[PDB]
Short mmCIF file of C-alpha atoms in Angstrom, two decimals:
data_model
loop_
_atom_site.label_atom_id
_atom_site.label_comp_id
_atom_site.label_asym_id
_atom_site.label_seq_id
_atom_site.Cartn_x
_atom_site.Cartn_y
_atom_site.Cartn_z
CA UNK L 1 118.04 117.11 118.89
CA UNK L 2 118.47 117.87 115.17
CA UNK L 3 118.98 116.16 111.83
CA UNK L 4 120.39 117.66 108.65
CA UNK L 5 118.59 117.24 105.35
CA UNK L 6 120.53 117.39 102.08
CA UNK L 7 118.61 117.33 98.81
CA UNK L 8 121.14 116.13 96.24
CA UNK L 9 118.61 115.96 93.40
CA UNK L 10 119.47 113.59 90.56
CA UNK L 11 122.89 111.97 91.15
CA UNK L 12 124.64 108.97 89.56
CA UNK L 13 124.70 105.97 91.85
CA UNK L 14 128.50 105.59 92.06
CA UNK L 15 129.30 109.14 93.07
CA UNK L 16 126.30 109.26 95.40
CA UNK L 17 127.62 106.09 97.04
CA UNK L 18 131.04 107.74 97.51
CA UNK L 19 129.22 110.69 99.07
CA UNK L 20 127.31 108.37 101.44
CA UNK L 21 130.61 106.95 102.63
CA UNK L 22 132.07 110.42 103.25
CA UNK L 23 128.96 111.52 105.13
CA UNK L 24 129.06 108.29 107.13
CA UNK L 25 132.69 108.91 108.15
CA UNK L 26 131.78 112.39 109.46
CA UNK L 27 128.82 111.12 111.47
CA UNK L 28 130.96 108.29 112.93
CA UNK L 29 133.52 110.93 113.94
CA UNK L 30 130.82 113.02 115.66
CA UNK L 31 131.59 115.87 113.25
CA UNK L 32 128.25 116.05 111.45
CA UNK L 33 124.68 115.69 112.72
CA UNK L 34 122.54 112.67 111.78
CA UNK L 35 121.99 113.33 108.07
CA UNK L 36 119.11 112.46 105.75
CA UNK L 37 120.17 112.49 102.12
CA UNK L 38 117.28 112.83 99.68
CA UNK L 39 117.88 112.20 95.99
CA UNK L 40 117.11 110.36 92.79
CA UNK L 41 119.31 108.07 90.72
CA UNK L 42 119.48 107.41 86.99
CA UNK L 43 118.29 103.88 86.19
CA UNK L 44 120.34 101.45 88.28
CA UNK L 45 120.09 97.94 89.67
CA UNK L 46 121.80 97.11 92.93
CA UNK L 47 122.52 93.67 94.28
CA UNK L 48 122.73 93.44 98.05
CA UNK L 49 123.86 90.88 100.63
CA UNK L 50 121.35 88.17 99.63
CA UNK L 51 121.53 88.74 95.85
CA UNK L 52 122.65 86.29 93.14
CA UNK L 53 122.56 85.99 89.31
CA UNK L 54 119.06 84.47 89.54
CA UNK L 55 117.83 87.90 90.60
CA UNK L 56 118.48 89.19 87.10
CA UNK L 57 116.06 87.96 84.43
CA UNK L 58 118.49 88.80 81.59
CA UNK L 59 122.32 88.53 81.52
CA UNK L 60 124.21 91.39 83.28
CA UNK L 61 125.32 92.71 79.87
CA UNK L 62 121.72 93.21 78.79
CA UNK L 63 121.16 95.75 81.57
CA UNK L 64 124.08 97.99 80.62
CA UNK L 65 123.10 97.76 76.95
CA UNK L 66 119.58 98.87 77.89
CA UNK L 67 120.30 101.92 79.97
CA UNK L 68 120.84 100.56 83.49
CA UNK L 69 123.90 100.84 85.66
CA UNK L 70 124.50 97.78 87.85
CA UNK L 71 126.33 97.51 91.21
CA UNK L 72 127.00 94.99 93.98
CA UNK L 73 126.49 96.51 97.42
CA UNK L 74 126.55 95.53 101.10
CA UNK L 75 123.00 96.61 102.16
CA UNK L 76 120.34 94.14 103.31
CA UNK L 77 117.96 92.54 100.78
CA UNK L 78 118.71 91.16 97.32
CA UNK L 79 118.03 93.01 94.06
CA UNK L 80 116.41 96.42 93.68
CA UNK L 81 115.87 99.07 91.09
CA UNK L 82 116.26 102.83 91.40
CA UNK L 83 115.40 105.31 88.69
CA UNK L 84 113.90 108.73 87.98
CA UNK L 85 110.74 109.45 89.95
CA UNK L 86 111.81 107.27 92.85
CA UNK L 87 112.65 109.20 96.00
CA UNK L 88 115.77 107.62 97.45
CA UNK L 89 116.59 108.46 101.06
CA UNK L 90 119.81 107.63 102.83
CA UNK L 91 119.46 108.26 106.58
CA UNK L 92 123.04 108.24 107.83
CA UNK L 93 122.20 108.17 111.53
CA UNK L 94 124.07 107.07 114.70
CA UNK L 95 121.78 104.12 115.45
CA UNK L 96 124.22 102.09 117.55
CA UNK L 97 123.25 98.44 117.99
CA UNK L 98 119.47 98.85 117.55
CA UNK L 99 119.13 98.25 113.81
CA UNK L 100 115.71 96.52 113.88
CA UNK L 101 114.29 99.54 115.77
CA UNK L 102 115.80 101.86 113.14
CA UNK L 103 114.20 99.87 110.31
CA UNK L 104 110.83 100.08 112.06
CA UNK L 105 111.24 103.87 112.36
CA UNK L 106 111.97 104.25 108.63
CA UNK L 107 108.88 102.09 107.95
CA UNK L 108 106.78 104.25 110.27
CA UNK L 109 107.93 107.45 108.56
CA UNK L 110 106.97 106.02 105.15
CA UNK L 111 103.57 104.85 106.50
CA UNK L 112 102.99 108.45 107.69
CA UNK L 113 103.88 109.87 104.27
CA UNK L 114 101.38 107.51 102.61
CA UNK L 115 98.69 108.43 105.15
CA UNK L 116 99.22 112.11 104.24
CA UNK L 117 98.09 111.21 100.68
CA UNK L 118 95.07 109.27 101.99
CA UNK L 119 96.82 105.95 101.36
CA UNK L 120 96.81 103.13 103.91
CA UNK L 121 100.25 101.48 103.89
CA UNK L 122 101.84 98.93 106.19
CA UNK L 123 105.20 97.31 106.79
CA UNK L 124 103.44 93.89 106.75
CA UNK L 125 104.36 91.22 109.28
CA UNK L 126 106.25 89.21 106.69
CA UNK L 127 107.78 91.30 103.87
CA UNK L 128 110.60 93.83 104.01
CA UNK L 129 109.63 97.31 102.82
CA UNK L 130 106.32 99.17 102.95
CA UNK L 131 103.29 97.86 101.09
CA UNK L 132 99.87 99.05 99.96
CA UNK L 133 97.83 95.89 99.81
CA UNK L 134 99.72 93.41 97.68
CA UNK L 135 102.09 95.96 96.11
CA UNK L 136 105.37 97.36 97.38
CA UNK L 137 105.39 101.16 97.64
CA UNK L 138 108.81 101.57 99.26
CA UNK L 139 111.85 99.29 99.36
CA UNK L 140 114.06 99.41 102.46
CA UNK L 141 117.59 98.05 102.75
CA UNK L 142 120.19 99.42 105.11
CA UNK L 143 123.74 98.77 106.21
CA UNK L 144 125.29 99.70 109.55
CA UNK L 145 129.00 100.18 110.15
CA UNK L 146 130.62 101.58 113.30
CA UNK L 147 127.12 102.14 114.72
CA UNK L 148 126.08 104.46 111.90
CA UNK L 149 123.60 103.58 109.18
CA UNK L 150 123.85 104.02 105.43
CA UNK L 151 121.82 103.03 102.37
CA UNK L 152 118.15 103.43 103.27
CA UNK L 153 114.84 103.51 101.44
CA UNK L 154 113.37 103.98 97.98
CA UNK L 155 109.88 105.46 97.83
CA UNK L 156 108.12 105.14 94.50
CA UNK L 157 106.67 108.55 93.73
CA UNK L 158 106.54 108.79 89.89
CA UNK L 159 108.75 105.77 89.16
CA UNK L 160 108.60 103.90 85.86
CA UNK L 161 107.24 100.79 87.56
CA UNK L 162 107.69 98.80 84.36
CA UNK L 163 111.44 98.76 85.06
CA UNK L 164 110.89 96.40 88.02
CA UNK L 165 109.75 93.58 85.72
CA UNK L 166 113.35 92.77 84.66
CA UNK L 167 114.48 91.96 88.21
CA UNK L 168 113.51 88.86 90.14
CA UNK L 169 113.64 89.19 93.92
CA UNK L 170 113.68 86.04 96.00
CA UNK L 171 111.95 85.05 99.22
CA UNK L 172 108.60 86.08 100.67
CA UNK L 173 106.78 88.98 99.03
CA UNK L 174 103.48 90.29 97.72
CA UNK L 175 102.55 90.38 94.08
CA UNK L 176 103.69 93.70 92.63
CA UNK L 177 105.03 97.19 93.04
CA UNK L 178 103.26 100.53 93.21
CA UNK L 179 103.88 104.26 93.43
CA UNK L 180 102.09 107.36 94.66
CA UNK L 181 101.46 108.21 91.00
CA UNK L 182 99.86 104.82 90.29
CA UNK L 183 97.74 104.92 93.45
CA UNK L 184 96.56 108.49 92.87
CA UNK L 185 96.27 108.41 89.06
CA UNK L 186 98.57 111.41 88.57
CA UNK L 187 102.16 112.49 89.16
CA UNK L 188 103.03 113.91 92.60
CA UNK L 189 105.68 116.68 92.71
CA UNK L 190 109.02 115.31 93.91
CA UNK L 191 109.65 118.49 95.96
CA UNK L 192 106.45 117.78 97.90
CA UNK L 193 107.26 114.12 98.49
CA UNK L 194 110.65 115.23 99.89
CA UNK L 195 108.96 117.74 102.23
CA UNK L 196 106.52 115.13 103.48
CA UNK L 197 109.33 112.66 104.07
CA UNK L 198 111.28 115.27 106.06
CA UNK L 199 108.22 116.05 108.20
CA UNK L 200 107.59 112.35 108.81
CA UNK L 201 111.20 111.70 109.85
CA UNK L 202 111.10 114.71 112.18
CA UNK L 203 107.96 113.33 113.83
CA UNK L 204 109.07 109.69 114.12
CA UNK L 205 112.60 110.39 115.35
CA UNK L 206 111.62 113.41 117.47
CA UNK L 207 114.28 115.57 115.86
CA UNK L 208 114.20 119.07 114.35
CA UNK L 209 115.13 119.31 110.67
CA UNK L 210 117.90 121.72 109.67
#
């Protein structure tokens, strides 16, 4: 009937990943409620299940020389970028076998957040993530182990969208990327975006936030 929200603020990817895994273990064990981690990462590129070297425009070494961290991970999707101004959410929830349903719920929550800003967003029939017209507002890529989810979503709030140009996702997609800031012509407070995300998750999942 409840979910726990933890706002970790700005956390390096590697230690945040270790934290995800510890949170996941507790939820698997039934010793922690379904938990939504909300956070930001310093500039980082992650390469998921479907990722290869073609997803990086420059050599790997270029990225580390130019202020990115880079990691290979086991979430769905190929390459993505996280950085300051992007609200990263890791719902570590006991989803069981119904992963597609879970993805649709994350999508729905994000669509609600966008609607709250007067923005019409949609999952799209054909592209992973949540889109506003031809531009991706929120990336989504999860993993599930022992019936509990990890990884999650990355909502562009005040993201430096220019940082996406150096990665080259593959497969079906729209044309670009967007953020609440770009759509609204001004920065949106991160604290507010977090609150709206929490409210949307509470509504979609039918759970009370603690």
